[PDB]
Subunit: 388 residues, 4 copies
Amino acid sequence: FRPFKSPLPLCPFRGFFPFHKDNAIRLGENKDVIVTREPYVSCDNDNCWSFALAQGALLGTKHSNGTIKDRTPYRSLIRFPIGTAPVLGNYKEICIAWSSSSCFDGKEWMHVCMTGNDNDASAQIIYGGRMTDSIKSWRKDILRTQESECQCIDGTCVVAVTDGPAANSADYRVYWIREGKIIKYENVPKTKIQYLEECSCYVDIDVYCICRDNWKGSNRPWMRINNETILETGYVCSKFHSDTPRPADPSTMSCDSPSNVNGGPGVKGFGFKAGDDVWLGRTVSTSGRSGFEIIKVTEGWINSPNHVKSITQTLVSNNDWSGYSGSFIVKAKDCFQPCFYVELIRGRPNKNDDVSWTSNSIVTFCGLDNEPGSGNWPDGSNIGFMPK
Amino acid sequence: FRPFKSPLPLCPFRGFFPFHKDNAIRLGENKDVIVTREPYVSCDNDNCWSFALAQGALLGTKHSNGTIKDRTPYRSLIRFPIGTAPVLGNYKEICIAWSSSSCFDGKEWMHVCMTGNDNDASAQIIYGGRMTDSIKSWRKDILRTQESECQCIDGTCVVAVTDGPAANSADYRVYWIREGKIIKYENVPKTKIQYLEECSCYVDIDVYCICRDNWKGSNRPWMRINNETILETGYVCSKFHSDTPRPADPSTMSCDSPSNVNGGPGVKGFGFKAGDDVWLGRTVSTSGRSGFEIIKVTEGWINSPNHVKSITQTLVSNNDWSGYSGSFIVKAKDCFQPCFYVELIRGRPNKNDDVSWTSNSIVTFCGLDNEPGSGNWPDGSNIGFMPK
Amino acid sequence: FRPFKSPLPLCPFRGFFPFHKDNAIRLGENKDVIVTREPYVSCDNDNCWSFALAQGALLGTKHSNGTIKDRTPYRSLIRFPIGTAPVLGNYKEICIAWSSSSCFDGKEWMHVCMTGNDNDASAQIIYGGRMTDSIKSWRKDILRTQESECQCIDGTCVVAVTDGPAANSADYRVYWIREGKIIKYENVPKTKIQYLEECSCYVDIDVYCICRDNWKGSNRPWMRINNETILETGYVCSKFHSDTPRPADPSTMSCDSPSNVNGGPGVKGFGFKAGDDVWLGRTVSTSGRSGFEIIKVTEGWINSPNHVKSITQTLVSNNDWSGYSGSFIVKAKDCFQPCFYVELIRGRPNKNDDVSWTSNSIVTFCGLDNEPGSGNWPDGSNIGFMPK
Amino acid sequence: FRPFKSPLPLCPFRGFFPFHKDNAIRLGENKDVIVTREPYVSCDNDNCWSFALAQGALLGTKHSNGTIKDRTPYRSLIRFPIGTAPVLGNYKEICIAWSSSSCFDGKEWMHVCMTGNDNDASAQIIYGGRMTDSIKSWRKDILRTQESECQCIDGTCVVAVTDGPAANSADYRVYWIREGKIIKYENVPKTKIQYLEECSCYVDIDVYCICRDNWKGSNRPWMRINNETILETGYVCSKFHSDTPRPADPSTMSCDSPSNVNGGPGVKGFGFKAGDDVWLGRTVSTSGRSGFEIIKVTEGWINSPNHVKSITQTLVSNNDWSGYSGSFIVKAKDCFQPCFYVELIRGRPNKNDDVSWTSNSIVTFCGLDNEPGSGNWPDGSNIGFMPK
Ligand SMILES: *[C@@H]1O[C@H](CO[C@@H]2O[C@@H](C)[C@@H](O)[C@@H](O)[C@@H]2O)[C@@H](O[C@@H]2O[C@H](CO)[C@@H](O)[C@H](O)[C@H]2NC(C)=O)[C@H](O)[C@H]1NC(C)=O
Ligand SMILES: *[C@@H]1O[C@H](CO[C@@H]2O[C@@H](C)[C@@H](O)[C@@H](O)[C@@H]2O)[C@@H](O[C@@H]2O[C@H](CO)[C@@H](O)[C@H](O)[C@H]2NC(C)=O)[C@H](O)[C@H]1NC(C)=O
Ligand SMILES: *[C@@H]1O[C@H](CO[C@@H]2O[C@@H](C)[C@@H](O)[C@@H](O)[C@@H]2O)[C@@H](O[C@@H]2O[C@H](CO)[C@@H](O)[C@H](O)[C@H]2NC(C)=O)[C@H](O)[C@H]1NC(C)=O
Ligand SMILES: *[C@@H]1O[C@H](CO[C@@H]2O[C@@H](C)[C@@H](O)[C@@H](O)[C@@H]2O)[C@@H](O[C@@H]2O[C@H](CO)[C@@H](O)[C@H](O)[C@H]2NC(C)=O)[C@H](O)[C@H]1NC(C)=O
Ligand SMILES: *[C@@H]1O[C@H](CO[C@@H]2O[C@@H](C)[C@@H](O)[C@@H](O)[C@@H]2O)[C@@H](O[C@@H]2O[C@H](CO)[C@@H](O)[C@H](O)[C@H]2NC(C)=O)[C@H](O)[C@H]1NC(C)=O
Ligand SMILES: *[C@@H]1O[C@H](CO[C@@H]2O[C@@H](C)[C@@H](O)[C@@H](O)[C@@H]2O)[C@@H](O[C@@H]2O[C@H](CO)[C@@H](O)[C@H](O)[C@H]2NC(C)=O)[C@H](O)[C@H]1NC(C)=O
Ligand SMILES: *[C@@H]1O[C@H](CO[C@@H]2O[C@@H](C)[C@@H](O)[C@@H](O)[C@@H]2O)[C@@H](O[C@@H]2O[C@H](CO)[C@@H](O)[C@H](O)[C@H]2NC(C)=O)[C@H](O)[C@H]1NC(C)=O
Ligand SMILES: *[C@@H]1O[C@H](CO[C@@H]2O[C@@H](C)[C@@H](O)[C@@H](O)[C@@H]2O)[C@@H](O[C@@H]2O[C@H](CO)[C@@H](O)[C@H](O)[C@H]2NC(C)=O)[C@H](O)[C@H]1NC(C)=O
Ligand SMILES: CC(=O)N[C@H]1[C@H]([C@H](O)[C@H](O)CO)OC(C(=O)O)=C[C@@H]1NC(=N)N
Ligand SMILES: CC(=O)N[C@H]1[C@H]([C@H](O)[C@H](O)CO)OC(C(=O)O)=C[C@@H]1NC(=N)N
Ligand SMILES: CC(=O)N[C@H]1[C@H]([C@H](O)[C@H](O)CO)OC(C(=O)O)=C[C@@H]1NC(=N)N
Ligand SMILES: CC(=O)N[C@H]1[C@H]([C@H](O)[C@H](O)CO)OC(C(=O)O)=C[C@@H]1NC(=N)N
Ligand SMILES: [Ca+2]
Ligand SMILES: [Ca+2]
Ligand SMILES: [Ca+2]
Ligand SMILES: [Ca+2]
Ligand SMILES: [Ca+2]
């Protein structure tokens, strides 16, 4: 017997530390590795796992040509041991998906898997390996979800879902799902948030989600959610913005609205509220998906004149390609430890990655209440060595 | 301790949804994948699994040349994680077989494995990994079985077996097997059914099997069976036929006899009785093994003037190759969920598949009481990229 | 908790049936498969396993050239799922060995592993993964053992071991080992047996071993052993001999001495006593390692004028290569089922196998009290397709 | 429930015996095997495991070129089944590391993983898969650790760590870690030891560590440690030295100070105290990393005029390449069995290994209270067959 996961507080932390790294592109030089993108990490009672949307092809084969394409019937959510490259001999196929979320509720895994036509997609809910429920596209425009782990509290899992156009008004919802059965949903209030997608969520008593506004906000939209309802919404107050593209530091403090500058197209990212402060992941570049750093902004969670970047950890240099990033948690004793992954995209459309495919490797970091050192942990592939 | 599976009713459902897809041919471009055909799916308490008849060769190697051939000593029933491509690093070999069935009784797996000479084949019964019993060919003409999962009720498993010619009178039996020991068999009554093979079965209180008449019936033969005996037999009443080849819709309503038109050679397929209605899988083409759709026919299970196709889901376009299809079930709480797989055959003798081998990938769908979206989930291989 | 295996009788049987087949050479065409020889099978509570002496090289690579060689430091006993080809992604390395035996005592696995110099080899005893004891070569001439499964009764395992020359007088012993600790050994009486090696053993209340005389006996030497001592010895009385080479049928009935004809070099083989009768495996050829058949000889276990071959099953045609064969058992309820494997050697020095390496595949059969069909289950490799 | 490992005495032993060997370089000829170095072995309740620092590349691929380099962001501690070659289909990635230690406390695994910049590295402590603590470089000069298994007593694990220059005064510490949390550390006393790194440790009631002085000592520094503190320190008294390089036998008896001759650069090695005697591993060559032998020196642990090499086992000939070696233990009933591994380095900078990469295979031996035979168990690769 295992109990459902509880509403634990986030553990104390003062810096982030290198955890697992798969080096998947380097290891894929001889065409062993499955083409992926939109990876993430999620853990059960016994293991943390890598997840990613595979492309139904091996890296460097003819079928990998053109895998920049976002949605195909040949994409599946796959799972593989954390920090290992995904290969045919180690992967598990979770469901057919070109958008996904996964989370463990203390007893079983839940997955949310979108596939099908852009104008008529459906999300399949998997629980304990069984398809238990589904969501039918209601705006008929690329029904989609987090691309990182959802969160579960006392047996009820919470997941953010979007249907509708990019860079215009769309529908944003949270779904509450228990043992694979949809209990209810809520349309996210639009009093503050104007656009939300690709939420990166964690638990600190309640579920916090920090997401991607691909329309008018260079600042990130966020929600606080419990097992019953959405409790609060906003944009991250920090005058230092964390989407990509975005304005140079310092920019506007916008707690209640999109920054109305450099709003599109954005990238999936994450942050962690800490007291009145906030930690924010972001690309080093303000324009492109290169580099990765994480900053701590004093009073960055609140309306304040005192925002300052107290800490900056540079984890992937600006000379290296990054991509999506997302939060995951690991249960410590009586608190949840904040961790995150960074997708390191290689191939199209990256400048000078002269290959026909698009894929990624993974690197991960976890938070400790200790002072970190410094380093650089990029993809590390010599793109010239690779099968094109 | 685990109890034997019970005689549960089928769960309510109103459409089918994409589950797992292996993309095995695409992933086999670099010769990692085992050549297979006649795949199916079956689940135990903890996992669903892919099964298939391997050909003792890797796809695209010289030994894969000529694998259109149905029966060789080098064919084995293999098992691999559901939705994964079968590779040497992930497969398990269950038994030597060129025809098979597998099912889990709640405690252990049973398999039925035919191999040997066409005129002197034997079926090996495996239970919990041990060879426990066997069936000796009695008509001496390709003793053979379902090529999809059998069914077990309160510890007694039921499996359909045929011995004798194709497109002429043969012998059809059901065998009852408990803990791997043959309890009894029955010759299927020929009052209605004139030919039966390759049964696709599921549980809805009793076992229902919908099978393949390769002789005079474009409609599918069926049986209702319990833990002791065959209870009913017939052909599916639906005036919309579901074998391949078959007449164009609408055709004859034949509840009690073969349609006596477009009877051969047929293809393995499946259906689900639902009240007085019936769901039927079928190729899109009325002549060839291309496309896959599933229809719901109002009152299609009974003798009625009111048959109509209330629903048609097109899951694989007619421009794509299909093949065999079969039912499997997944235990929900107090009901069994209806699912099915579709074999996507590539290679010989398919027109324009210019390779020397014959193999397949898999796609699967499960039934939910929700409205589906729409999509297309074909093999997806560019046959031109493949090692011939 | 699991009890130690008990002294069960052999189950009734009247023929042998195809079980698992790995097709390892066919599947090794693309250099994925580990080079092996001297395979065997042994089972624990939950699985049967393939074992073999690997050669520390992949089939078809430059390091596989010359693997006809019997003993090197690069040979390890490896284990892989039964009926699968041994590959880097599925194998386990048990110990360094160029001669081995393995058996499961009901709780844990024991292995006996010989390696080192011909004139100073030692056998390592492994129990539950730990090296627990050892045997030092005492005749200083290729200390060696069964190359098939040993047997364990009420926690005491029995294994036959030889040290000394081939085709001359050597030392033969049985060792009793409990939880990996050597309890005692006995020098095999030489009142009847003149040479013994490579014993194939099973349990029928007591342990029976049928072995290889590589000196003067075309008939096979045998022993009956319990948890304490050797109880009986002899040669198989059957006037139909079962070593290779051997005289044509019928030959001499020699219950108490080597036949004194066609004695060398012999091949590992097996048999099963059944009442006063005996089942004997043997190559089809009387001179070479080609084909495989199993015969039942009426009264073949005893001194009698009534020996006759009541049954002959031809399992591998004489046009196909065979090799070693050995017994293993599978617990049925209150009896042990007799099974056997056949090593199918390909490569050097086989005539017309034009490659530089030597390896093998595996096929297995189990006994049932049912009438068998007929078939042929050879290696199946087109040696011309293989990397040399 | 499993108890924490106890302070057991070392088991009696009088020689070492071949255990597991992976033949990883031979098996890597077709580019399947992960490039590694600094391997070791450590066991839990159910299995012994191989560990090594991978290089984020497959052997023989372009990314393997230049892997002589010691520290990169693409190095991870990986785990794979003992005696198997590390491949993508069997490995687990434990953490990002270019220096590591691992040990099992009876309940869970702990790992210590150093990565990042040379002048600002940090060690991540992993316990039960979760990052639980860390050590920040304090001398800012390649914070580093054992490269073999740590040891745990009654739930408290002990690990030796160094920060500072090579061939000059550095800082050496022991850390005590419980359930992944650092309890305390101690600076190693410098009353006797002048330099310590790469400790090879085992348990004999207390923890004994025999390490590498890379400065002034051709004799090896050692410590005796319990769950609370460092109890004793010294250099191995044996007038026969065991670092590499070192003086020819016999050299100085230096129980309390470095030999002050042939002190650098040294190699990781191990030994076992036995009564007043000591067993010492060492390369056969006194100058290079070739060959491997283990000696027993009578009274070699103490100050005595009676040191003599009572036993010499030559396990890898001087014509073969060796490398690092380290101790590990296996629980026997009420004692710990002493075992060790030897890293067999191939590639740069080894003379005549004409390839661009640097990697290794593994061989292992365990101690028994029996007389051994003799043999030779080198890497066995024909470097000429390998992809460069
Ligand atoms: C949602 O969970 C609560 C229990 O969790 C607490 O309340 C949540 C709203 C949130 O604030 C958490 O952080 C809190 O820890 C459930 O409330 C329980 O309901 C049962 C049955 O009525 C009752 O016996 C308990 O006393 C309640 N527990 C508490 C602490 O109030 C609530 O039922 C959950 N809602 C759903 C829809 O599952
Ligand atoms: C990646 O693929 C492109 C496109 O390939 C073509 O279209 C595909 C859908 C498929 O049908 C292929 O068979 C086609 O070749 C390649 O670009 C083509 O290259 C060919 C051969 O040099 C050239 O004749 C065409 O004009 C190109 N077509 C286009 C639209 O650019 C490209 O070479 C592939 N990249 C790699 C690294 O192989
Ligand atoms: C077959 O199973 C029945 C129990 O299942 C019920 O009866 C079947 C025929 C079928 O209609 C199912 O859907 C039903 O749920 C067994 O009947 C039991 O037998 C035992 C022993 O005699 C008796 O104690 C119980 O009362 C019976 N149970 C019921 C509900 O009647 C029957 O034994 C099974 N037959 C075989 C050969 O195994
Ligand atoms: C697939 O195999 C066929 C047949 O191969 C021949 O017969 C086999 C049983 C085996 O013995 C092979 O060695 C033989 O080559 C191939 O067709 C043959 O191709 C060869 C060479 O071009 C030609 O000389 C023969 O006439 C052909 N034989 C026949 C009966 O057609 C075919 O090329 C193979 N396909 C692929 C993609 O390689
Ligand atoms: C060997 O096993 C016997 C028990 O097995 C029986 O005797 C064997 C010799 C063999 O004939 C088997 O087939 C039989 O089933 C052990 O005898 C037991 O010893 C214990 C302790 O003295 C005693 O309490 C039991 O009564 C004995 N059991 C019987 C049936 O006699 C014997 O100890 C074993 N010897 C060793 C060395 O382990
Ligand atoms: C299998 O190997 C033999 C022998 O290889 C030679 O000796 C080995 C130990 C090793 O040192 C190799 O590098 C040597 O090549 C091969 O036979 C040799 O082939 C070469 C090249 O054609 C020839 O010059 C030598 O005379 C041969 N030596 C002998 C003793 O025959 C043989 O070709 C290999 N087989 C295959 C299929 O590659
Ligand atoms: C360290 O372990 C001891 C128990 O182990 C013994 O003492 C060690 C110092 C070492 O000498 C071992 O080989 C010995 O076996 C712990 O001592 C126990 O402490 C508890 C709580 O105070 C007490 O109830 C027991 O009586 C003590 N046991 C003994 C045998 O003295 C000690 O607590 C451990 N220290 C730490 C920091 O964990
Ligand atoms: C191993 O690599 C070296 C170096 O490769 C060069 O530098 C690397 C960092 C990378 O940028 C590569 O693309 C470069 O080629 C190889 O040595 C080079 O070989 C090339 C081609 O022959 C030659 O023109 C350069 O002068 C060489 N550079 C140096 C510094 O020596 C070497 O060939 C590789 N080894 C193998 C076995 O391939
Ligand atoms: C469902 C879907 O296709 N989501 C997209 C996504 C999307 O286009 C934008 O967020 C706008 O809505 O962006 C990104 C892109 O890297 O920005 C990759 C995704 N790829 C996949 N999830 N497959
Ligand atoms: C035992 C056997 O060989 N069964 C056949 C089968 C058969 O020929 C017909 O159903 C007529 O009886 O049809 C099909 C074919 O795709 O229609 C493939 C099978 N291949 C295998 N099961 N191996
Ligand atoms: C230890 C050893 O090398 N045993 C031999 C063996 C042996 O030479 C004879 O039985 C004579 O004693 O025969 C055979 C051979 O196939 O006949 C293969 C073996 N190969 C291995 N077991 N590695
Ligand atoms: C952390 C680190 O880089 N340690 C080194 C090491 C080191 O340079 C010396 O011991 C001197 O301090 O020596 C050796 C070398 O083989 O002697 C390999 C190591 N490689 C790795 N552990 N990655
Ligand atoms: Ca934005
Ligand atoms: Ca038909
Ligand atoms: Ca003989
Ligand atoms: Ca491969
Ligand atoms: Ca030194």
